Design a protein around this ligand. Sequence first.
Ligand SMILES: CN(Cc1cnc2nc(N)nc(N)c2n1)c1ccc(C(=O)N[C@@H](CCC(=O)O)C(=O)O)cc1
Ligand SMILES: CN(Cc1cnc2nc(N)nc(N)c2n1)c1ccc(C(=O)N[C@@H](CCC(=O)O)C(=O)O)cc1
Ligand SMILES: [Ca+2]
Ligand SMILES: [Cl-]
Ligand SMILES: [Cl-]
Lengths: 159, 159
Amino acid sequence: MISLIAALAVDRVIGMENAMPWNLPADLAWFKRNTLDKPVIMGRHTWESIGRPLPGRKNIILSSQPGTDDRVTWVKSVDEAIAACGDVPEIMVIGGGRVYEQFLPKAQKLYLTHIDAEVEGDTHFPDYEPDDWESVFSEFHDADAQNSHSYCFEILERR
Amino acid sequence: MISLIAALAVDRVIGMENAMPWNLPADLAWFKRNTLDKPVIMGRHTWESIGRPLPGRKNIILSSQPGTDDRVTWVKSVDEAIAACGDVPEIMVIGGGRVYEQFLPKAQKLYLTHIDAEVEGDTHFPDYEPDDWESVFSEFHDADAQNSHSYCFEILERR
Ligand SMILES: CN(Cc1cnc2nc(N)nc(N)c2n1)c1ccc(C(=O)N[C@@H](CCC(=O)O)C(=O)O)cc1
Ligand SMILES: CN(Cc1cnc2nc(N)nc(N)c2n1)c1ccc(C(=O)N[C@@H](CCC(=O)O)C(=O)O)cc1
Ligand SMILES: [Ca+2]
Ligand SMILES: [Cl-]
Ligand SMILES: [Cl-]
């Protein structure tokens, strides 16, 4: 099954021209917890943003352009990306916008981090129909000594 | 010689308790480069936001409350903090507000990171009459894939 994992600010903003203006180690911990030991599929821009391969995961980069790093797997189609995953119970799609749009239709679950941040965004998470998804987990947290904004973790399963 | 190092948003607003709404790894690198191998003095809120002893530095916490942890030095007054430092060429004071207020009068150098972020806050870096201080170094940087905002490093010497 395919799952999408994303951090969304108000109005579904997922990316800006520069790094997102928040400091949320709790979100990174949640992301690591939910992606460890699974293949992760990402676009080139996300890859460049991370800076290195994510440890303990099979890193798959979906891009039309050619591969710049030998430590990860470079693919050119959604179909090739899927095949590269092998026989695994769950494949995680980590962004960005375009990638999420291409995988949404095939996704059965969403792991979402809603962040109370108002920002002008460049890219947005695709519009989902809340009537088509069932929230099976939610947990709210306020900003604290280490997290700059309040956020809420949510997991949704396709109805 | 006592130095204060701080990251300031517009209007000199500084953190109080919750993490600041920005992501500036360049500023943390700057921070590390200027404090490594030196004693650092911080208040209780700063300590909680860091979450662990800064490696390669002598960690001194100035607070009225008590020493939770044994890996760091707990002091109750300015004088005691100074003394805990021993005889070193430079003592770094890393915040927060009250701590900066207490040491400014005794400070000979300021390492400041001016960030182009408008943050609502109660706390401000103490007022310094820049004509009692000589700006010795200033280097601007634009925001990028890794740094959420534009920032400018500045070093000032007490004239
Ligand atoms: C820019 N970026 C993309 C990113 C960031 N936050 C997200 N948060 C959520 N919920 N979902 C995403 N898809 C997401 N993607 C990043 C950047 C760094 C790391 C990262 O360092 N992760 C470490 C965990 C944190 C650490 O070790 O500092 C890991 O092992 O996953 C992950 C994603
Ligand atoms: C909350 N906090 C206080 C903090 C943050 N930025 C500042 N920035 C400046 N310029 N000045 C300060 N006094 C300052 N203080 C922190 C939090 C984490 C780290 C930190 O992790 N530092 C690592 C470097 C980054 C890393 O290893 O992730 C180090 O070795 O100094 C430092 C300060
Ligand atoms: Ca439910
Ligand atoms: Cl991308
Ligand atoms: Cl403090």
